[PDB]
């Protein structure tokens, strides 16, 4: 398959890894901080997803330095991964239009 499709698949796998790792690390970073809510794994996984998609409801978020650092990694991974899917779609469309034009 073409590069853009391979890259998209890879990006998806990497994002899943980051969501899982981010959830584990977020709990690790936040427990020990009075008042923190990102402290159990199931909801931390949910938090990682709404952060990677940049939805950010505000129901859960990190209060510590390391939790916030983990958060930035999750954000960047989500933004870049979805952006890469967009880039792959554009490449697919560009190629199809070239053909349709007989170029």
């Amino acid at each position, epitope marked *: 398959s073409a590069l853009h499709w391979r890259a998209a698949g890879a990006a998806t796998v990497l994002l899943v890894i980051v969501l899982l790792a981010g959830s584990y690390l977020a709990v690790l970073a936040e*427990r020990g901080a009075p008042g923190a809510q990102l402290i159990t794994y199931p909801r931390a996984l949910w938090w990682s997803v709404e952060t990677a998609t940049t939805v950010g409801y505000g129901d859960l978020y990190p209060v510590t330095l390391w939790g916030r650092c983990v958060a930035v990694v999750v954000m960047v991974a989500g933004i870049t991964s979805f952006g890469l899917v967009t880039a792959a779609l554009a490449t697919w469309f560009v190629g199809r239009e070239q053909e349709r034009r007989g170029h």
Partner: antibody
Amino acid sequence: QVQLQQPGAELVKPGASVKLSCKASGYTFTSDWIHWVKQRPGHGLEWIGEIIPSYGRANYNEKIQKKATLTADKSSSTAFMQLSSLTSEDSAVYYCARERGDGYFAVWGAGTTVTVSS
Amino acid sequence: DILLTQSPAILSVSPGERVSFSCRASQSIGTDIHWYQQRTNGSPRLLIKYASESISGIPSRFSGSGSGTDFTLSINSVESEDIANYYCQQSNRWPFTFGSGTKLEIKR
């Protein structure tokens, strides 16, 4: 079978210290946290602290004087709590409990009755 | 730190009657409350998780309800084996905390 095994009792001279143990069996996951809870005779349950074996990180109750130090041995699947410079105020039953990272203590040890006396 | 208030501290009920234990949290904690039973000379035993979720091995007699700041542990038709101390515990915010406990007494 018993998931958490703790010694029945420990006698400690005032000022001295002791190391309590909690041997765990059954399913074990990287998300497991081992907690320690203190209970004075006739009184309620007081959270002491927690440790995550898969990483070695430990957190403690900030409201009370820190008497404990938590450690864990992955190979022997054993968690330890070092209580130091104890006084009669430290005499109590100390329970270890297992939490699967989801907030509740699914299982508890039988508890170790610690007595601080000469 | 979240304060869990369990009042009254002692509940007196007659055999077979329905009883309800109260646990009030100092702030809203959704349904992140769990209940434990501790009989004389025994270790705590998980009865209900996340305010209303059943635990395998626990008599259907036990149920839980509530969300926010007010929670209830109910026993339908109490019997002798239910005599013990009952504690609530929250896991919504760090650190986890326990209520002061309520003792169940039976009037026979």
